[PDB]
Structure 1
Amino acid sequence: VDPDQTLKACKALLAHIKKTVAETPIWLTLTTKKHIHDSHRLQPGKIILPHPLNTSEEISVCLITADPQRFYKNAVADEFPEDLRAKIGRVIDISHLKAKFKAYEAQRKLFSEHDVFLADTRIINRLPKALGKTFYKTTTKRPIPVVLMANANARPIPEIVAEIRKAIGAALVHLSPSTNTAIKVGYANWEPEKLAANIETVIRELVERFVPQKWQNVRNFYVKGPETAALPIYQ
């Protein structure tokens, strides 16, 4: 697959969107040809983008840890003041989440409060039934994996902050048992060269990491906007 087709298609698509003011996400729709069965392939992943997805001007992260919440809150009070303490408004363990936040109004207030979410890989299995469907199933604001894994068994704190810096702007990947998925690459206010770079590295990482029996199982990637038509890419 050559990226010149992606560049001409995404330029035509931005012209199609235009002809604040845009503020629409652009994604590519993955199709595969065989059903997906492995529950370890059904795990949500992240793809680190070369141009990060988030603006990081005023957005607030929420960080969901597992075992002692006081240890992780003291690490947040310890480590890094420039980028991290302005963003990390809450550190919630999964026990405190399942305790305090079971109500529809409470999880609606949390979803309206915070801007983007991060969780640990031992918790995102638990999270679609801890956090509500109005948090999880509806929109893109849903937790991204951050590997806080080696008194809690935790990775060392500079690697923790490096992982959170990598994972704030990363692109979330959900897989589904069906054969069609879609994955966001950016917005419509961006430049199409950056868009085509994001689509290229997402194609590389999506196939060669997540879709099993990789380029055998691949089907068409159709670049799409919110309400527009889809443009081909590797039929």
Structure 2
Amino acid sequence: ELLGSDAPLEKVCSALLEYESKRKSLLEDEQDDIEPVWLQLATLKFIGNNRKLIPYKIAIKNPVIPSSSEACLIVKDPQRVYKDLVNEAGLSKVVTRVIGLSKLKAKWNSYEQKRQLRDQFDIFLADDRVIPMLPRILGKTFYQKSKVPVPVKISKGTAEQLKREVVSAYGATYFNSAPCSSFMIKCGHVSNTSTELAENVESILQFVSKHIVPDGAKGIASIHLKTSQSIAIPLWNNPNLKELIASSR
């Protein structure tokens, strides 16, 4: 309704569940990893002035990061105070390691050391005040292997805020803005059913049209639904994209 005064949802997302299921065709270590759902968006005009190395906190109701995924928290000095707060909040099983910024800069200097730290956790969360430093220190070994630290605001440093922020951080999808006209957003996996997947799509679309696309949903060229190896089924096409680009330019 917001995008084009129409809602061609539900039917396409539900059909995609059967489309990937039909395309199904001893090991010791097993995991519940599922193929992600890639929501492709095309915009009429470029949406990024420059490479922004922070994710978008797209709040969602169906988390794309399972609660079994380990988390690593990066805080400002000293690390002992925030280590005590994490333990007192009951996040020991979630926030496994808390690394102070000075310790992260010093004790992890080699590329192999940075890669070992990167592979030791599934998601990285960072204090909002220390996020601008992580472009350095962490380097290309983090920002290209799908490991972008999350800007979690823990400024006041209290247990309830930590629990709310982590739950909010886990229950959200992220997308790193890049200068282009096309991008993909993680909407979920096959584990999430059709109705939950549809809810994730519309919530992301509202967030995208609000704080990502400068002119809103009117500037959306086309949108498609895709998986790792599935066909990019066209979710929706702008009925007036061709004339809008001609008139704008």
TM-score band w.r.t. shorter chain: 0.7 to 0.9
Q: Which of residues 119, 143, 149 in structure 1 aligns to 2:149?
A: 143
2 CA distance for matches of 1:161 and 1:175?
A: 27
TM-aligned CA distance change 1:117 to 1:205, over 3 Å: same
Alignment of 1:126-137 (within 5 A): 126-137=133-144
TM-score, normalised on structure 1? 0.85
Alignment of 1:57-206 (within 5 A): 58-77=68-87, 79-81=88-90, 84-139=91-146, 141-149=147-155, 154-206=156-208
Any stretches of 5+ residues in structure 2 without a counterpart? 23-30, 238-249
2 CA distance for matches of 1:121 and 1:80?
A: 19
Deviation string for 1:197-218 (max 9, x for gaps)?
A: 1111111111112222222432
**Rg larger for:** 2
Aligned to 1:218: 220
Structure 1 position 62, deviation (Å):
0.5
TM-aligned CA distance change 1:122 to 1:85, over 3 Å: same
Q: Which amino acid in 2 is paired with 1:68?
A: P
Q: Which amino acid in 1 is paired with 2:76?
A: A
1 CA distance for matches of 2:152 and 2:208?
A: 18
2 CA distance for matches of 1:227 and 1:128?
A: 31
TM-score, normalised on structure 2? 0.80
Percentage of pairs with the same residue: 35
Aligned to 2:241: none
Moved more, 46-55 or 190-199: 46-55
Contact 1:22 1:188 in 2 (8 A): no
2 CA distance for matches of 1:124 and 1:50?
A: 25
Q: Which amino acid in 2 is paired with 1:96?
A: K
TM-aligned CA distance change 1:166 to 1:22, over 3 Å: closer
Q: What secondary structure, in the 3-state scheme, does the structure 1 residue paired with 2:233 have? A: coil
Structure 1 position 148, deviation (Å):
2.1
TM-aligned CA distance change 1:71 to 1:50, over 3 Å: same
Q: What secondary structure, in the 3-state scheme, does the structure 2 residue paired with 1:232 have? A: strand
TM-aligned CA distance change 1:40 to 1:110, over 3 Å: closer
Is residue 2:55 matched to residue 1:44? yes
TM-aligned CA distance change 1:211 to 1:40, over 3 Å: farther
Moved more, 121-130 or 97-106: 121-130
Contact 2:124 2:150 in 1 (8 A): yes
Deviation string for 1:24-83 (max 9, x for gaps)?
A: 101211221222345697742211211122321x32210111232222112123x322xx
Q: How many residues align?
A: 226
